[PDB]
Structure formats: structure tokens, C-alpha cells
Design a protein around this nucleic acid. Structure first.
Ligand SMILES: Nc1ncnc2c1ncn2[C@@H]1O[C@H](COP(=O)(O)OP(=O)(O)OP(O)(O)=S)[C@@H](O)[C@H]1O
Ligand SMILES: Nc1ncnc2c1ncn2[C@@H]1O[C@H](COP(=O)(O)OP(=O)(O)OP(O)(O)=S)[C@@H](O)[C@H]1O
Ligand SMILES: [Mg+2]
Lengths: 804, 802
DNA sequence: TATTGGGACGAAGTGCGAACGCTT
DNA sequence: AAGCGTTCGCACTTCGTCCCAATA
């Protein structure tokens, strides 16, 4: 059955997909803002207003397809809008492609230059072209006046702000809100400019001054393209091909009438066998490596491009007969020649993957396809949840003046925030990442982005039109016909020498969720696989979890003091599930068991956190920032020396071998290590203290007390002596001082006296992995875990059994 | 011996100096240093008395930091009879404590038309500040005179978990402070940050400060003595069971530093004295009662679960043990008690040293002027909180406080606006210092000393150097480490009494109440929950029910797998307390399941059908009636997967952990086996047979047959709004008679026989009704902060385009 | 059969003259 | 605008772990 809800749910899903990308702009703008005029340009390349006459409005905002001549229309308009040779202008881009292109492509203008590296002068800057992420180092030189302003891919330009790669955001936001107050004329343009951008520009220069252009033409490469969403993956034809041949008789009994739906690997076979040239988008690497291993049976001259392969220019694609690629082509350049006969795409919505806008910008990287084909498969395994674009959202968004909620719905404890610019467009980054949780919604977003570029999207069977029934009956197929095939992509998965294990590991959800919690977000997958290989062994798990608790008790200093708070930290970091790679190269989950009595662990991190602070510990910076002699080690331990001796002894043979950290192997290592320690009083304190220090750091956390070459103490080498830091090394050792004021002479004094600073020194070095945990210095955008640590350090423990 | 040197002198010197600055021990030193224009006076003889209210020298706003026991309210009577002229003059008096709401309206005889808290004409009104959200919007906008009695307590109850309309009560208080011309404020621990806040809003020249230095004999001129030893070796010999008393031992031969609590108690109680005993914990109050019962029969106990007696009931008894209940009751005035003992214990979920201080002053005058205090540091082992790094940062910055221990700045919770933000530091350092014994001890030593009482530590008759304090401190830390063993082999042993007070003191149980439950709960209903929670089925039903409510609070969790791992790992893993059948408390682990999809796919179904109902586990089960007509409409929209999961969960190949455990999967398979196949049976009757197993086995919530005469509300003794007219046209026929709601009910009394059908409601069992749920209201814990994060932050792409 | 002592190479620092930034 | 306070390119080497080949 249809189930009643599906008419309302489909029609809501399609309507919000249309609204978020501005598919309704020709109806909404003349209804809600009568003082704004709107242009529809229904044929031929786009054209802007008159570039010189006084009758044109000063703010014009353009929604116009990918591949419709927009750079040519901007060239035609900018050469006029620069009114005089003294007129000065600024151009902003999100994408790298225009920073290289526009400065090279403008021939109708002079003194134009790309992003600033070495031209710094003091100030001359006009006709500057910039990547928005780099704007912070250029801002002071702009002098805060321009006569003309241009934004292309403006929803990407205001969309870069949400990405973790932008830094010093608030000061760049405060500059963006300085240009945009219509000191210049403004032109703003995108393929998906929307109602909320037209509204926001009214909020900077009023309804009277805003003009809207809507383009509905795109080049033959797109307007003749005939996308088709297939019903079934066809892995049974893959298993007959990529594997060695099956038995001479007894094939699979299912799907004998083709299951009345053409299949991706079935259709791919025909074009490669017919001698066509072809190209293959793949949103995940694990399928890219599989379809490479398939294609070499039909045509040996395959190419494969993904984020761990080396740099290769798009001009090289003329030689190869199959080119396979992932979303790395977004930051590349268009393939302008005519070569490929058609195109295939495996799109897979998943929680840590690409947005459907990022897929659409990658499909468009080959311009003309000779037959006009394109076949897309949407793999619904891993995205089969209840929808996000509900009729409960539609009624709210359509009753309001087109304004969206800032969360999943209306509301309230929240972060500090940027300006009106950052907060106005936060709704779009939210729903671009929520909708990946559903295969409908994701399919209706992708279906919109294609249908806004004239691409005649079709399903299987339904050559022309679909009712709500026809659509809902289609997804009851691809939800099941994908899931029952998914097991094949575990058997076929690469264990050959070509296998990109660092890429195929990181693709999983379980690794994504570990990287979010424990590590720095900028780690290379190659260093995660060096870590996850250690965390398989029970000793390796133990050291990593002790070192994660040491870092947390430095970040949250209240954890060293209240026992109630340390239970909340221990339950969050040192319990649950981790991913690990076993001796075979397969990836397996491991459960970390809880412990009832955390007291023996807490007393030992409580006595190590104060001994780490005093050595300027930061595991992201390699280890201890300060060198110590053996006498300094004695001075670290001496205040609590008998208590270090007690707690190192107790963990050798605890009452119960509970949880992870007091497990049977973990207790044995410390009991073993105590056999090599000199007995108390048999050797000098400066020796016994070193012998105990090396055991408590060495077995629990794994960190070595290495020698170091530093010819003066503290953090600084001889290259970084300063007029301040010299004096501390004149006070100690009582050097004669009374020197000449000039630092050249203070250096020459110590380089004569350097023999005073002979003698042994040590430094703590962290073990190769573990140099990538999120330490106290390693700042990043807030995740849910950084919020929880900010909660523990700010809210006090309020009393329970109360007189009200 | 043990080394001390001078390394630890900064710890004491910082600790004592920060304690001083928090409670205002440096008014009339800091004021000339930082605000020279503000006038200051010292009163050192007899009662305090405020400046004349009638003269031209009646400047603006006055703040008073007079001791307890120095005549605050009588000096206010003198000042207010000079401040009130003609009856048209306008006044308001604010109190935090209940005691003045009863007292002042009864005690004022020099004035008329005065009244206590309200249950347009309003003047001479006296109010509890916890009523200000009801009272405030009914008041006139400005008054000629304003009294803030116990001001630091008045804007102190403002931080209470049960406070209402906080975002407007901050603004109401600010409006009164901004434009009332004459104001007086009177807390015995007023401080420099209240001086600064009023100097900010009214100007440095305007404010005047009164500092009291004398308090009446007996009331606040005792001889407080701290003792170094509890003396439990005497206790466990004294509480010897029947038979022989047993012989002495040579371990008693040491000097015991010359004094012990149980020794100095016994020597006076045997010597004929009548003795109160305060105890911060009930588990010690119930022991020291038994130690007196063998010496005399006239022994009371008054802990928080007993019926509260009026203090005139005391004075019959030889002993009257009590525990912080007297925070909200009247003070005992008669000269009955010879002396008094206290046991104070810093605890992370216990009462703070200012709440302990005003519990010791609830007995007023003593026949020999003595008071002996023991600080049990056994659960305050930790490193100091009042560090020199905090002292330097505060003292360098004009004495401004940082309001968190990190000294660093981003959750903008901001429930108030300005008063809430200015004073937030005080509640934070009042709770944090209970983590440590030295810092709790130096606060309590200050609060006694800044109220005239001479404080001594036993054996140090003249004065303490930092080293002398550090010797006494490490001593009493060792005493409480040893003596705590005796207090565990001794116990109440449950004479059919006080299990909830013995349970509730445990820090493991506080952690359970703040994570899962409503903070409204009494100890009595925690015990019967934790006693159920010991059974393996009980603890499985509880955690399925806790997860169902989180799936209604966070609506992304029912649709993102990455989000449901954050919720599952938090509400369904880790350690919980339980009560064993033996009558003792035991911790039990919830082990981490590797694969959660079998659970997520079930909650994803239950939290959609629970939203077709109005499910609300604190208010009932279902807020809505339903029947076998409706149950078909619950199951049939998504039936293709409901058919599998309840059967398949009973037949899984492997058992990852609790929610899929060997006991649970057999139990659900056995229960489900009574369901027919889809053949030779009614679809509705098959549907409801399945429905009772899904809800009944896994969540523990049964059906009950409807007593409602109509759908929704349907009692007939009295009518309720819209419940008749909202059904009167639902039968698709017109009555045309009348529109007045009440008398129309007779029309539905015809329809009752054709509205009829089999109708039911889900109901939550007696243990389940104290969960924190989506309909509830409370102040933010770390967990409500987390659920705001999971719902408001989207999930970023990780293997990124680097 | 008997088990370890010698060689390679990552990686963090030495020390000369110098470069950048600044204000006589 | 010459003297001058942080910071460094380059050629050199010292520490510790990996590995193997020559003994037994
Ligand atoms: N590097 C280039 N060389 C030549 N023409 C280019 C180049 N980059 C862009 N174009 C122009 O781009 C037009 C395609 O339509 P447009 O809407 O202008 O594409 P666009 O929005 O610039 O897309 P891209 O992704 O930036 S090429 C072509 O007709 C070209 O004239
Ligand atoms: N509860 C009370 N019972 C009797 N007299 C009281 C009481 N409270 C105040 N007084 C009178 O006011 C003075 C004592 O008040 P203080 O101890 O200085 O401060 P207070 O806060 O008013 O006392 P409390 O807290 O109300 S017991 C004496 O003159 C008493 O006669
Ligand atoms: Mg463009």
C-alpha cells in the first residue's frame, strides 16, 4: 500500500528542495517585494543591466545555471562599470579556479592581480582578485573603499564561513560587513542564489535598490544531457567477472526477467565492450577501486583519481579510455575538449560524506558528452531513516515570510556567533548536512539541482512523468535492491597490493566517530592507520587510554579535584567502542569495559597531571617543553615520594582485576618493572627517583626519558637567545654581568662561559603515534565533546537531598 | 618526622586571603584603597545603629555588614520609624529567609497597615524573595524606601534549582535598584562586589558603608574548639553488645593529643550536662544517638525524615540531635543547654559552610559557652582550590572575581541578565571548596571569626603560623582516614528505620539522580527504585525506557546513526547503583554493545507510535485514549518491518550486551510465542496481541481499560472547558439548541451509546514516573547541555578535500 | 651446531654570520 | 637613518632504534 502519508511527504520533500535552492524566485520576489523588479531570461546567454546609465539599480543579484556564459556577461559589464581609469574595484571568489583564471582572462582592463603573497606595499591595492579563505592577510591594505563589488558563487562565498578550514573568522566577517554596505555598486551571482539572499540584500540597501535576474538557458553540453536513475546495481554480473569464473552449471535463480530493471554494471559492460570512451564518478573510494578492477577486463587503459593519488593535470584525460574520479575534481578545472561518450555515477549519501551540492559541482566537470548519456545510481544502504523534509517544516516555512528555523525545528543554550552574515545563512549548512540521513530528500535535492540546469531527469520505466505513487514505489525498490547487494561489496573489497587501506578505513562511520572524539581533525589517514594498528593490542589500548585521560585532566583542571567530575570524564573517554586494525589488515571493533572503582586510577592521574604541568607538557608539540636534570626529577617526586611508591606498588596486585586499566596483563607489567628497581635506600636518592620516574611514565603512558643536546637549559635553543632570557642564565651561576647593552655582546659573553652549562639533561618524548591527540593547545571548531568539557568546567555540583 | 619548610606557606596564606575576600573581611580596608569618595564607619561598642534617616546627612543608599547577634532588626526598627513620615510614604521589605516573613509583620508595633506575603493598594508589604515572580507584577513601579534584608541570601535564593521567572526577576530587582531613592541592605557577609555593584548603579559619592565589630555575650561570644581526634576506639568499646564488656588494650596508652570527640562528649554527658548535637550527615547522627541511649533515656533525634518539632519542645531532653532542618525554622532562645557539639563533613553533594554556619547559630545561648567541632576530611583528600594563581589574578584586578576555576573563557546559558552574572562567582566558589579540607576549614574559621566568636584549635592556645596549621591539618586527615573503618563496621543495622537517609548520602547515588531522574525526588522513592533495579529484567526495562524518552527530547537521534551512538553510549553504558535483597547498596555495570542497530531500529519505531499518542511518562503513560481501531493505525503504516524486529531480536545469533542479553532474548522469544500466525484470525486482534508484547515486555508498560465516558476527558461530576463543545459536532449532526458550554453535556449523554467501543490507555509503572522527560522543567545539568549540542550542531565531513 | 656486536639512518639540536623590522 | 632586539639558513653531529651477519 501507499500508506496515506506518502502523498504529503513526497510533495513536502520536493517543495522544500525547490525552496532551499531558489527554484521559486520568480513567484516569491514579485509577491513579497513589489518594489524589486525581476528579469526572466528564457533563451540565450545571461545579460546584466545597463552598466553605465543612471537608471539601473545599484544592487543586482543573479540566479543563473552552471554553463550559461556568466563570466562573459561579467566581462561585458565590468569593462563598462569601471567608469574611469581611476575607478577602483574588488572581486571575491570561493573557488580556486577563478583566482587563476580571471586575472589571466581579463584583457579589457589593466593593473588586475590575483591573491596577495609578496606585493605588500605601504596600500596601492585595486583590481584585486581574492580567494575568500585568504582574505584576512589582505584586509588592512584595502583601505575600506571601492567603487564596484563582484561576488560569483556567492552562496559558496558566504558558505565557506562554516568550514573548519577558515580561521580568524570574526575579523573577516567584520570586513565583509564593511564592503557590503553599498559604498560600491553590488553584483552577486550563483547557480543556487536564493530568497534569503534577496531578502538579506534588502536588509543592507533597501527594497528600492535591489534587482533580480533569473536565467533559464545553459549550453548544449547540459541542455541536451539526459540523466536517468537506474533501479539496481547488478553485482551478480560483477561477481561473474571480477572474480575467477564460477562453476560450469547451476547459476543464480533470481532476477531471470532482468527483475524488469537495467543494472549499472550491466549497462557499463555494453559501452566498454562497444569501444566507447567513458568516465565514472564515485562518491566513495571503496567502489572506485572496485570499478577500476572491473574495467581492466574490457579495456586496459584506465585512470583512477582520488585524494591519496598524486597530482595529475586534467589535460592528460585525452589519452585514457576510462577515467574514474571522486570529489577531488571540485578544486580542479573543467575538461573543455570533446572526448567522453557518456558518464556514470555512484552516489552514496552518508553522514560524513559529500553534500549533494558537492556531487553536482563534480558531475559538471566534463562539459560535452557525445551521446548525451548520464546514468546515476543512488545507494540507499547506510541512509534509510525517517525523512527530514516533513510537512511539519513546510507549514512553518510557508506560513512565515520564507524564513527557515536555525535548528531541526524551532528551538536554546547556544554558542557565541558571528554577525548578521554568519547567522542569516546557518540554516543552509544545517539542512545540507541533515538531509544526507535519508535517500528520499537526498534524491529530491539531487533531482532539483539537475532540473535547475535543463538536464532532462528521468527514472526507469516512467519516460515522462511521475505521480507520488510512482515515486514511492521506486524507492521501495532501490532501498532493498541496494541493501541485499551490499554484502557483495565486502567480498569483492580490495585485499590486493593496490588496496588503498588508509582511504578504505577512513570511509567507515566507526572511524569517523572516533576521529571526531579523540584526535585533531587535520590528521592524515596514513597516521590514523599507524595508530589503529597499535590499539588492537591490549597493551596498546591501555597506553592510549591512560594518555587520553592525562590530556583531558590538563584541559579540564577541575577533574583533578572533584571525584564526581572525574567519573563523567572517565565514562566518556575510557569506555565504549574503538575501531582497530588487526594483524591481517582487516578492521575490527573493540569494546572497552567499565570499572566500578576508579579511585586507584584517579589518584595516579591526580599525581601525574601536576608533574606534567611542571614540565610544560604538550603531546602535540612532541612532549615536554622543558629539559630537567636528575636532581629536578628528585625535586618533582620528593613532596609525595612515599605515595608514588605506594601507588606504583598497589597496581602490581590489585584486589580485583576490574575493567581495562586493572586487567590481568596490565597489572603484571608494573609488578615485573619493580623487579629492576634498586631497593629503597640501597642507592642515592638522585638515582632511585630517576628509576621510579622512568617506571611510572614508562609503563603507564609509554613515554621515554631521552637525553638532549641543549647547551643552555629551558625551552630555547642557542638560535633563540633574547635580551630577557639571557639574564636568568646570568643570575644563576653568578656570571660577572655588567656587560655592554647590545645583545651581540651578551651572546659573546655566554659563548665564552658555555662550559658552566655542561652536565646531563633529559626530555620526555611521546611515542610516534599519540603525537596526534587533541591537546590543550590544539584549538578547533566546537564538537559535542568540546561543549561537554566546557560544561564540566563551568557548572558546579548542586546539592541533592534538599530542604527546597 | 615530616618536612614542611616554607613551600606550603603560600597555600595557607592564599587560602585564608581568598576566604577573607569572598565574605567581606576587608571592608574598611579596601574601600579607602579603591573607592575614596564612598563614606565608611566602624561601630565597636554595643548594638549597631544605622545613620539618622531624617537629617540632611541621610545620603542615598546604605549597606550594612553587621555580625549575627548584634541587633540588626532592632536597628532597622529605629531607622524605619525615622524613614516613615506621613502614611502616604512608600516602603517595601525583602527577605530570603522564611523567619522574617512571620516575624517582622508581627513584631512592628511602631507602624500600621504592615502585612506579610500575599495569598494595587500594596504598601508596607513584607515578602519572601522566592514569591517575587507572583508578587512583583502586582506591585506599583517605585517605592520611596527599599530594604534588602540578608541581601547576599536574598539574591542568593535567586540561584536555587526551583527558581521561577528568573529572566524577569533579575530585571525587576534591577528596576528597584535603579530608581528607588533610599535603599538599605543588611547581609552579615556583604562584600566588596556588592559595594562595587551599587557604586556602579548609583555613583561612588552616594553610597555609605556600616561595619559592625561587636555582638552580644553568649549569642556570639562562645569558645569554639576544633578537635584533632574522633576517638572511635572508645565508641566501638562503648557500643559493645550484651554479654561481657571486654578488657582494655595497650593501643589505648598514647596521649591521643589530649582530646577526642567521644571522650569529651562522654566526660560532660556523664557529668550531668544537657547537650545539642548538630551533624551534617544523618549516618553519624544515628550513631551518636546510640552512644547516649546507654547513659540516659531522654534522647531525641530530629533528622530531615522525622516530623519537625517547634524548638520550645526542646529543653525537656538531655540530648537533641538534629541535621540542617533548622535552616528554615526559628532559633532556640532559652538558657537550657550547657554546651553543644557539631560534626561537619565536606562532601560534593552536601551542604556548604555558610549553611553549616547558620545551622550552628539556631541554638542561641549556652550555660558554659562551649562548642566543639570535628571536620571529617575523609572525602576531601584533594589538592587546594584557593591557589596563589587565583589570589594574584583577583587582587591585581581591583578585586574582581573570575567566576570559574580555569581562569579562562562558550556555552552562553544566561538565564538571568545582570544580577545573575555579577554574583555568579559566589555560588561557584561555595560549592567548589567542599572538594578540599583546608579551604573548607579556612572558610568555616572565617565565618565564625567574623561573627565575634573566639576560635581555637586544640593545643595551640596563642596563635597559628602556616606551619602549625599544616601540622594540625595533616593530623586530622590521618585521623578521619583510620576512624572511618569503625564507622563502617558500626552501622544503624536497620531497626525498621532510616534506609533512605543511609542511602542518599552516597556520592554514587547523587550521580544517578542527576543523570536519569527529576531532582524533585525524595529518598523514600529512590530506595524502592534501586531495589527494583537489582533484577536483570528490571535494569533492562529501565534503560529501554530511558532511551525512549531521549528519542523524544532529541529528534535527530531517531534518524542519524552517528547521533544515536552518542546517546546510547551515554544513557545505556557505564555504572549504576542498585540495592540488593540483603538490604545493602551494590554497583552494577552496563556493558557496551558493539552493534546497536537492533536497538536503534526498535526505538525508531516506538518513538513514532509514542508520538501518535501523547506519551509523557511523568504525567501518566499516554495523555490520550485509544482503541483497537487506533492500534491498527499505529502498526499498519510501517508494518513491513514491525513484523521482523520483535521476533528477530529473540533469535539473534550472538548477544553483544545487556539490551540483547541471553536472559532478555529468551524472555522476549518465550513471551512472543503466544502470537498467532497471519491466518484464521482477526487483523485487529493479531495487532493488539503484538502491541501488548512490544510495550509490555521491553518497556514494562501495560494496558488499562478506559473509565472515560467520552474520548479524552470524560468524568461527569463537574465539567471542564471545551470538552463538551469539541465533541458535540464531531458526530456530524446539529443540535441547534444553545451555545453555553455546561448545560450542553446532556446532548453527549445521548451520544455516549454510539461513541462507544473498546478503549484503553498505556500506563507507566510505579518506578518509572520519576524519569526526566520532554515535558519537564529544570535548571541545566551537563546532560541537558549535551542534548542541546547534539540537536543544534550538524555533523561535518571528515575525510576532507585537503 | 650458537647467539649477539657492529653498521644506517631519522630527528632534534649547535653555532656563524646574517636578515627583518624600527626608531634618531 | 646606524645601532640594535627577535629570529633563521645551512653545514654538522649526537641519540636511539633496526637490522643483520658472523660467530657457536
Ligand atoms: N578557462 C576558461 N577558458 C575559456 N573559457 C572559459 C574558461 N573558464 C570559463 N570559461 C567560459 O565559461 C563559459 C561557460 O558558462 P559559464 O556560466 O560562464 O561557466 P562558469 O559559471 O564560469 O563555470 P566554470 O565552472 O567557472 S568554467 C564558456 O562559454 C566560456 O566562455
Ligand atoms: N528569633 C528571634 N527570637 C527572639 N528575638 C529575636 C529573634 N530574631 C531577632 N530577635 C531580636 O533582635 C536581636 C537579635 O537579632 P540578631 O541575632 O542580631 O540578628 P537577626 O538576624 O535579627 O536574628 P535572627 O536571625 O532573626 S534569630 C535581639 O534584640 C532580639 O531580641
Ligand atoms: Mg559562476
Amino acid at each position: 500500500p501507499i500508506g496515506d502519508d506518502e502523498c504529503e511527504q513526497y510533495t513536502s520533500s520536493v517543495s522544500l528542495a525547490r525552496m532551499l535552492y531558489g527554484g521559486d524566485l520568480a513567484e516569491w520576489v514579485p509577491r513579497v517585494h513589489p518594489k524589486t523588479t525581476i528579469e526572466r531570461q528564457q533563451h540565450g546567454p545571461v545579460t546584466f543591466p545597463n552598466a553605465s546609465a543612471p537608471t539601473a539599480r545599484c544592487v543586482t543579484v543573479v540566479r543563473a545555471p552552471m554553463g550559461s556564459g556568466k563570466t562573459t556577461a561579467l566581462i561585458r559589464w565590468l569593462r563598462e562599470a569601471i567608469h574611469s581609469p581611476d575607478t577602483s574595484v574588488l572581486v571575491v571568489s570561493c573557488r580556486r579556479s577563478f583566482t587563476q583564471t580571471l586575472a589571466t582572462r581579463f584583457a579589457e582592463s589593466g593593473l588586475v592581480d590575483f591573491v596577495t603573497y609578496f606585493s605588500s606595499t605601504n596600500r596601492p591595492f585595486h583590481r584585486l582578485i581574492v580567494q575568500v579563505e585568504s582574505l584576512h592577510r589582505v584586509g588592512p591594505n584595502l583601505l575600506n573603499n571601492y567603487d564596484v563589488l563582484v561576488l560569483d558563487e556567492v552562496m559558496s562565498t558566504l558558505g565557506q564561513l562554516y568550514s573548519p578550514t577558515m580561521q580568524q573568522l570574526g575579523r573577516v566577517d567584520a570586513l565583509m560587513l564593511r564592503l557590503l554596505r553599498t559604498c560600491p555598486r553590488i553584483i552577486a551571482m550563483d547557480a543556487t542564489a536564493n530568497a534569503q539572499l534577496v531578502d538579506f540584500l534588502c536588509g543592507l540597501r533597501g527594497e528600492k535598490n535591489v534587482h533580480v535576474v533569473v536565467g533559464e538557458y545553459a549550453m548544449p553540453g547540459f541542455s541536451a544531457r539526459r540523466c536517468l536513475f537506474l533501479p539496481r546495481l547488478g553485482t551478480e554480473l560483477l561477481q561473474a567477472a571480477l572474480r575467477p569464473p564460477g562453476p560450469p552449471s547451476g547459476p543464480s535463480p533470481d532476477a531471470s526477467p532482468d527483475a524488469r530493471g537495467a543494472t549499472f554494471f550491466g549497462e557499463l559492460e555494453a559501452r566498454l565492450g562497444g569501444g566507447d570512451n567513458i568516465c565514472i564518478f564515485s562518491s566513495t573510494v571503496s567502489f572506485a577501486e572496485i570499478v577500476a578492477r572491473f574495467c581492466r577486463q574490457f579495456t586496459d587503459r584506465v585512470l583512477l583519481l582520488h585524494s591519496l593519488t598524486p597530482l595529475g593535470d586534467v589535460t592528460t584525460w585525452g589519452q585514457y579510455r576510462v577515467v574514474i574520479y571522486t570529489t577531488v575534481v571540485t578544486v580542479g578545472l573543467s575538461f573543455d575538449p570533446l572526448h567522453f561518450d557518456g558518464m556514470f555515477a555512484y552516489v552514496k549519501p552518508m553522514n560524513y560524506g559529500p553534500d549533494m551540492v558537492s556531487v553536482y559541482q563534480s558531475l559538471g566537470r566534463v562539459r560535452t558528452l557525445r551521446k548525451g548519456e548520464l546514468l546515476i545510481y543512488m545507494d540507499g544502504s547506510g541512509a534509510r531513516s525517517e525523512p527530514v523534509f516533513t510537512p511539519m517544516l513546510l507549514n512553518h516555512v510557508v506560513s512565515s515570510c520564507g524564513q527557515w528555523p536555525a535548528q531541526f525545528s524551532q528551538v536554546d543554550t547556544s554558542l557565541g556567533r558571528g554577525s548578521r552574515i554568519y547567522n542569516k545563512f546557518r540554516y543552509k549548512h544545517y539542512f545540507e548536512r541533515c538531509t544526507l540521513a535519508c535517500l528520499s530528500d537526498s534524491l529530491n535535492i539531487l533531482h532539483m539541482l539537475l532540473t535547475l540546469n535543463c538536464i532532462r531527469v528521468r527514472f526507469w520505466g516512467h519516460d515522462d512523468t511521475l505521480t507520488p505513487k510512482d515515486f514511492c514505489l521506486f524507492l521501495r525498490g532501490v532501498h532493498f535492491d541496494a541493501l541485499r547487494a551490499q554484502r557483495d561489496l565486502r567480498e569483492l573489497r580490495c585485499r590486493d597490493p593496490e588496496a588503498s587501506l588508509p582511504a578504505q578505513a577512513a570511509e567507515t562511520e566507526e572511524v569517523g566517530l572516533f576521529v571526531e572524539k579523540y584526535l585533531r581533525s587535520d590528521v592524515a589517514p596514513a597516521e590514523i592507520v599507524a595508530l589503529m594498528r597499535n590499539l588492537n593490542s591490549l597493551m596498546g589500548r591501555t597506553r592510549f587510554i591512560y594518555l587520553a585521560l592525562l590530556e583531558a585532566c590538563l584541559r579540564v583542571p577541575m577533574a583533578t579535584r572533584s571525584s564526581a567530575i572525574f567519573r563523567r570524564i572517565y565514562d566518556h573517554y575510557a569506555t565504549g567502542v574503538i575501531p582497530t586494525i588487526n594483524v591481517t589488515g582487516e578492521l575490527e571493533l573493540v569494546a572497552l569495559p567499565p570499572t566500578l572503582n576508579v579511585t586507584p586510577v584517579w589518584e595516579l592521574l591526580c599525581l601525574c597531571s601536576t608533574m606534567a604541568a611542571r614540565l610544560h607538557w604538550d603531546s602535540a608539540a612532541g612532549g615536554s617543553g622543558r629539559t630537567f636534570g636528575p636532581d629536578d626529577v628528585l625535586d618533582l617526586l620528593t613532596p609525595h615520594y612515599d605515595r608514588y611508591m605506594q601507588l606504583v606498588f598497589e597496581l602490581g596486585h590489585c584486589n580485583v582485576t576490574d575493567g581495562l586499566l586493572l586487567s590481568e596483563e596490565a597489572v603484571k607489567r608494573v609488578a615485573d618493572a619493580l623487579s629492576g628497581c634498586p631497593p629503597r635506600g640501597s642507592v642515592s636518592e638522585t638515582d632511585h627517583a630517576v628509576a621510579l620516574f622512568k617506571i611510572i611514565w614508562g609503563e603507564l603512558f609509554g613515554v621515554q626519558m631521552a637525553k638532549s643536546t641543549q647547551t643552555f637549559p629551558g625551552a630555547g635553543r642557542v638560535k633563540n637567545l633574547t635580551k630577557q632570557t639571557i639574564v636568568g642564565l646570568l643570575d644563576a651561576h653568578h656570571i660577572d654581568h655588567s656587560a655592554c647593552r647590545t645583545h651581540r655582546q651578551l651572546y659573546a659573553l655566554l659563548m665564552a662561559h658555555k662550559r658552566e652549562f655542561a652536565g646531563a639533561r633529559f626530555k620526555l618524548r611521546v611515542p610516534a603515534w599519540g603525537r596526534c591527540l587533541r591537546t590543550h593547545s590544539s584549538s578547533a571548531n566546537p564538537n559535542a565533546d568540546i561543549i561537554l568539557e566546557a560544561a564540566l568546567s563551568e557548572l558546579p555540583t548542586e546539592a541533592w537531598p534538599m530542604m527546597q
